[PDB]
Structure formats: structure tokens, C-alpha cells
Design a binder for this molecule. Sequence first.
Ligand SMILES: [Mg+2]
Ligand SMILES: [Mg+2]
Ligand SMILES: [Mg+2]
Ligand SMILES: [Mg+2]
Ligand SMILES: [Mg+2]
Ligand SMILES: [Mg+2]
Ligand SMILES: [Mg+2]
Ligand SMILES: [Mg+2]
Ligand SMILES: [Mg+2]
Ligand SMILES: [Mg+2]
Ligand SMILES: [Mg+2]
Ligand SMILES: [Mg+2]
Ligand SMILES: [Mg+2]
Ligand SMILES: [Mg+2]
Ligand SMILES: [Mg+2]
Lengths: 252, 68, 117, 234
Amino acid sequence: GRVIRGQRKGAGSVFRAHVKHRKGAARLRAVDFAERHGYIKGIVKDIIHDPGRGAPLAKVVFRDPYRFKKRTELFIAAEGIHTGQFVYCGKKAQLNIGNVLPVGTMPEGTIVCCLEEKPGDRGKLARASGNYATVISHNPETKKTRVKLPSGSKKVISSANRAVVGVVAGGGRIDKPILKAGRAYHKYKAKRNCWPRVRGVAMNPVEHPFGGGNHQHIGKPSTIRRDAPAGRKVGLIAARRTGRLRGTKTVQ
Amino acid sequence: GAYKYIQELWRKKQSDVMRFLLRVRCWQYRQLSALHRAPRPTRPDKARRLGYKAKQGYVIYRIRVRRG
Amino acid sequence: KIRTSPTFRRPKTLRLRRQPKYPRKSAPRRNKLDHYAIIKFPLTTESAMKKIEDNNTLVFIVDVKANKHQIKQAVKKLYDIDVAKVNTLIRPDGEKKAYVRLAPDYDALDVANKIGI
Amino acid sequence: NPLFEKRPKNFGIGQDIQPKRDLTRFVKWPRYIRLQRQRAILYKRLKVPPAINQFTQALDRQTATQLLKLAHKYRPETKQEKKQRLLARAEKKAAGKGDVPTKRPPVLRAGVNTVTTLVENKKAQLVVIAHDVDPIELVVFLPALCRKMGVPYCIIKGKARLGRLVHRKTCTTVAFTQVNSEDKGALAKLVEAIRTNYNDRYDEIRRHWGGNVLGPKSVARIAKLEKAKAKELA
RNA sequence: GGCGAGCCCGAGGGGCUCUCGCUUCUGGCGCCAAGCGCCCGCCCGGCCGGGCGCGACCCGCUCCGGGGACAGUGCCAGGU
RNA sequence: CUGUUUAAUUAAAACAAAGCAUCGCGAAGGCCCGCGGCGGGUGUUGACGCGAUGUGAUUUCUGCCCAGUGCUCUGAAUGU
RNA sequence: AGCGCCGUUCCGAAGGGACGGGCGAUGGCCUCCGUUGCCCUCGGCCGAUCGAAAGGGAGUCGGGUUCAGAUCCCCGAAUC
Ligand SMILES: [Mg+2]
Ligand SMILES: [Mg+2]
Ligand SMILES: [Mg+2]
Ligand SMILES: [Mg+2]
Ligand SMILES: [Mg+2]
Ligand SMILES: [Mg+2]
Ligand SMILES: [Mg+2]
Ligand SMILES: [Mg+2]
Ligand SMILES: [Mg+2]
Ligand SMILES: [Mg+2]
Ligand SMILES: [Mg+2]
Ligand SMILES: [Mg+2]
Ligand SMILES: [Mg+2]
Ligand SMILES: [Mg+2]
Ligand SMILES: [Mg+2]
């Protein structure tokens, strides 16, 4: 039959990210001599609003240790920073809010954000607004460190990758109901075309596996496995359970 | 004088004296480009029995294709 | 030699100047758009004739491959008269209409009587 | 003396900028540079077969200088003196009408086919085998062949230096076959040391395995772990 | 290397064994070397214009890290 | 609720909607495109994010059944 | 297999430029200047190129003229 709505996301025709008005990618300084054997002073000039993002962007200017040139970078603004604060970065930087430093320096229980999976990818984990990680379980030999992620997973990572100390500013963004379709329209028009949200039962049988019949009913078990082909994984994908929760996660 | 020795050494291309050179050449040619020019044949006996004569005009290319 | 930069680039080699052994067309091609081929037809209509009295300006029909400078040089090297300015338009039949305004020392009626329009 | 102050710059982290250092090991080298460098490193890392580990086990420079001083006056003739000898012999046989003015021309032979023919027919008195042939398959049969035919062979470093005694870019092989009257003792003095080095120890060299050398960072890591283990044991 | 500490022997001194550093009140500035030591053509023992080194330690065989004989690739076989 | 829809027979009780939920995924990943490459979309993105569905503002409720069909977890203790 | 296709910074030796100094040569009124050839030194392209007659984009306005032109033609007055 007809290609479903879920298969059109891979074409990239009209489902691309609205990426022009974004001010740039929010990354850290890549690791160098001044960030592996010391620290360097950096000044946050202003903080701006990246569209399609509720977390504020921070324009932190640096100084190149090798050539006479001021380098301007784009950090995720931690909570409580302000313009004119000397944001430090490196190995032996002192632990304050905003000072990105490797996890081997900080003690256990240090609430950080914008950390790295592998050392040198400029910030991947815990980047959304109002989220953080928990640093625990250091090791003298075999330099690894457990981090509790916002999903609750305890990931073992390296001890050389960096993380800005604090939480991401903009916490509580999902506290307000959108309260009308207009603000949702403006929000998704800012982010990307992720909003042809039409009910799969309400649409046609030839366009979705669930639609059809004289009544709006599913008719088929919506729990569909991970071994399903493309165009089949609709509804619940590899659902190990369903219904109302009981406990927190019950996953080791 | 030598080309029969080169032929008989190339025939048993599973032995240890040849498979090291074959592995080194496969790594070198894989880290090279796809289609380029080798300035001299790496198999002189096979090139000469296919028609290479060491004079001005005959060109040797080295080329990489995919299997399957 | 100390290579202080972490980027290796091309050395400035010695590029040779082109010094060929034989020419490739045996002769320079002659100028087909010469003075007799730029300015083709003087326009002798009413609106082109009234400009001679009221404008001190001649009207000519020019091939489309010529410009203001070539029209000016062609008029000065054929009619032995000075040119103040040249205004060109593309006539919609396919040719170029050139209004050649002359210097105030010359007389457009006298030049028109000498060229026969 | 009037003003002439000193203005020191402290090159630490977080202050006045770094000077232009050597930066040799950190420049982004091109594709073929990295190819040849990691190719040499790959030959150093991997275990080479015992028929090509014979290379880098070659002749020292004093005996190579003696060999070059012996081979300098057995040089093959170039085009200029070749045409000169042709025209001179033609003019002498046209004027004086001589039959055999030249008894024996002493000259060495070059080329792998010619050297292999001479060692198979036992005409070769000494074999000089080049080191830097990039297809080693062209060379690998020659040491065992010279060993079984009893002709002494010496492995030398540099095929360019052997090409410059034959007026060519590559020579790859030199066969000493004919000797003069004033060179027999010196050639025997060379052949005795060459048979001491290679022919009397071919069975020792063929059993040895080359390569198997780790990188210096890994060697220092294993040495640091060994010193830590020795500290823990004592 | 102590303007720094370390654990000891110990009379100066010794290194069993260890960690390097020279930027943390400030919305300032910071590059194209100061100094020192040698070598040249110029004013009879003087003056101008130039080169090298120390400043900025030496050597080395991967740009640096993270995985690693796994992942993937080519073919064959069985499920779905 | 405002909005949208069968242009050329329907304007709706239909669709959408905020709210309430559920499931997958910590990047060698989830869902997809591609005949092909470790090629692309989400991704200038990182669980307050992305992807897939049910219901449809607020208040009050979410009863009982895993026998069946699905989805998921575990162990070469164990049949094929 | 292939016309060709993927991709736009990715796996590229992807700057042909100028300043300053030194040396050799040529020319003009060889006083004084302009070039050629070599050496040293410096120099991220966010990567060739296209893409708006409504986006960015320096500077012309007044009177008169024809059957048909007008900030364009004539006169006068300005600017880049
Ligand atoms: Mg809630
Ligand atoms: Mg919804
Ligand atoms: Mg809906
Ligand atoms: Mg319908
Ligand atoms: Mg169907
Ligand atoms: Mg039913
Ligand atoms: Mg050639
Ligand atoms: Mg109607
Ligand atoms: Mg609730
Ligand atoms: Mg409700
Ligand atoms: Mg129920
Ligand atoms: Mg354009
Ligand atoms: Mg304009
Ligand atoms: Mg009009
Ligand atoms: Mg006007």
C-alpha cells in the first residue's frame, strides 16, 4: 500500500530541522594542553536564546594560548552564571558553578551537566534544560567513573572526559501547560516539522496498519516487536509491559 | 634466468614467505586510492607474459574493486 | 628548516611560462568589425531628421556587437568630426540605433549635407 | 647601560603566548608520507619471514668500501667510451689489419637473470646482492641458490650505489666472475670474510626470526608494569 | 630545580620511594623577543648594516585519546 | 472551545487541538531513507530530547479477568 | 556493469597573494625611478561556482520637448 507517515522521516524532504535561525552548535572547547595540564580564564560576554531550545546559550570568549586571537565559543549556560563571570576551564580548575573540568578531579556526588561520553566530543550527555548527572564510584586503577543520568541509568564512563559543574539553566520548562494549539504551533514551527500528529486509527487502512473498520478501533495488538519490518513498527514498539505503572523502573 | 623462480615462488601463494608480503601489499594498496598509476609492475614475470616490455609507452595502473 | 605550523601545504614550485614552438593559426585574424562595418546605415526618417536641426545629433544604424567607444572611434575616423556623446538603443527589428551628438564646433546640417542625407 | 632593561616572558599556562616550537611530530603529514612512515613502522612491528629477515643483516661499511674499491676498476663501459672503443678498434683493424688485438676483456656482469645464469653454471666467483629492492620476491631466491651452488654472496645496503658503478639507476646484482692478475689475492681476502659471514652461517640465519618489536610507548608501559611488579614482590 | 613540601638513614650528605609549579577578589592589556654569548665588510684601535645559539632541555617508531581480533565487510545456512 | 477538511453533490456529531497516559532509545543507540559506501533524516540534536500510538478541555471516577492472540525477561538445567 | 550517482567539508600536498630585506639583469632624461628571476618572512578557505528585476547594495534632481520618449532627449543645477 501507501508509504506511511513514519517512513517519510528518512527522506529528509520536508522533515528537516528548522536550522537557519539557530545561532550555532552548543559545544565545549576541544581538549588541548591548557585543558589537560592546567586551566585558562574565559569570560562570558552574553547569553542568548537559541531557537528550538529552551536551554540558554552562553557566548563565552576565550584567549588562544598559541596565537594572538580571542576565540569565541558557544557554551550551554549553567544555572546562576552571569555576564562578566570568569568561567574557568581545565583539569585543575577550582570547583564552582560554570567551571567545566574532568570528572576525575571532582569528588563523588558532584552534580554536573553537559558531560561527555568519550573524551573529546565536546559535550553530549545531559544537555536539555534543567537536567543533570550524578558523579559517583571513582577508581584508582582502570580509570572509570559511574554517572547517574537523567533517565536513571548508571553509565560507566572514562575519568578524563569533562563536564560543566551545575545544572542546565531553564529548569521547569514543562511546568506550564501549552494551554492552546497556538503556542504548540509556534513551538513546533520553531523546532522542526514534527507535527503531522494524526491518529493512526483515524487515518486510512492503506496508509497505516491500524486504521479502518466502521468503528474507530485498532483491531490488532499494538505491542509490536523490535524484529518488525519497516512500516510495521507502529503503536507500542517492543513494549515489555503496558498500563498503569507500579514501582519506579524495576530494571537492573 | 630468474622469471621461472619468480613464477614458482608466486604459485605457492599460501606459504609464509609470500603471505607476509601479500598482507603488507594489501594494506598498502587498501590505504592507497582506488585508481592510480604504478610506475613499474610489482609482478614482472606475469606482466611480461601478459605483454609488458620495459620501454617508453607501456603504462601500469593499479585498481581496486569490491568483492561480492 | 623548522616547520612551526601544524599544517603542511604545497611548496611554491617553478611554473614555466608558455613558450610554444609553432603558432596555432598561422596569422592574426583580421578585424571583421572595422570602421566600415560598425556604422552601417544613417537613418533618414522624420524623427531622425529633426534631431539634426534641433539636437546637433546624427542618427545611425549600428551592428549589435559594437559599443559606445567603437561607435565614437568609427565616427571620428571616418567622418573626421568630433563626438560629444553616443546614446545607443536596440531597435526592435534587430539592429542598434545610435544617437551621436557632436561637438559644438561642428554643424550637424553641414555634416549631413556632406554625407548626403 | 643607559636604559637597556630586560623584559622576560613567562611561558606558562594562562599567560603570555607560547613561542614557535619545532612542531615536527605534530604537523598533519600527507597521505603518501603517512603511507611510507607507517609502512616502515609496520615492517618494524610485524614478524617478517626468515627469508627476508636476512635484510638489515648486511655488510659493514669498511668491507663495503673495500668491495667498492675492488669493483671500481671492473666498471662496465658507458656509451661514450663504448663508441670510442668501437671506432678505435675499427680504425686499427682497417689500418694495421690486425686479427686479435684484444685477448681478454675483464668486466663484471649485471642483472638478475645474468647473475642467476652464472651461479647456475658456476661461473660466478662472487655475488653482490642489493638490499633496497621493494619487491623482495625478485631477490629472495638468490641467497639459497648461491648457498647451494657454493658461490659466495654478500648483502649490501643501497642499490643506488650499485647502480652508480654500472651507470644506471638500479643494478640489484653484481657478479664477479673474471679476475685480473693483480686482484686475485684481494678478491680471495674478500671471499674469505664473505664466506665467514654468510655462507658458514646461512643455517643459523635461516632459523632466526626478525621483527616482533613493539612500539616504544608500549615498551615503556611494559617496563613500568615490570618495575611495579618488582616493587610489589620486593 | 627549592622560592616548595614529603617517609627515613644521617655529621656534612645520601634517594629506599614519591607529586611537579610557577594563570583564582576585579567585564583592562598581552603576537611579530628583551638580555646574554660567538662570527663578517666599515672608522687604528672607534662607528653603521647583517648571520647563529641560549632564552623556548635531549631522544624517540604511530597527531592525540577511546574500542579492538571483537564490531563490521563478502558469501552460505536457519528463523521472523 | 478558536482552527481545518471531501476544489466540481456533504463543513459535520468528521479531522486537528492543549490536557491525561503508555512504549523504545545513554549515540557501535531508538524510529526511518537509500541499488551502493560505516552514505543520510531526526542531528547546529542528548531523557524537561527524539521517535510511535490510545484518548481528547475542567470536576469525579480508570471496576474485575494473562484462559486466548500479541509484546517482553531468564537460564546450553532442559526436547527440537 | 553503466550513462552516471552519493557528499559539500568529509579520508585532499585543495593560499600562485602582498609587505619588508638582500642579490643579478633590463629600460626611460641611467640624477631619480619602474619591472624581471632567486632566497627569507607573513598570510584557516568555514572551502570552486550559481542562487532575489519586492532582501543587502555609493551616487539626478527642476523646467521644456513628440503623433509615439522621459529621473534617459535639450537647458540649468548637483553627486558618487
Ligand atoms: Mg505531568
Ligand atoms: Mg498528542
Ligand atoms: Mg489527532
Ligand atoms: Mg476516513
Ligand atoms: Mg497494510
Ligand atoms: Mg471485535
Ligand atoms: Mg616510465
Ligand atoms: Mg458544501
Ligand atoms: Mg494528574
Ligand atoms: Mg479529560
Ligand atoms: Mg480498564
Ligand atoms: Mg549572484
Ligand atoms: Mg541602485
Ligand atoms: Mg509614456
Ligand atoms: Mg526632470
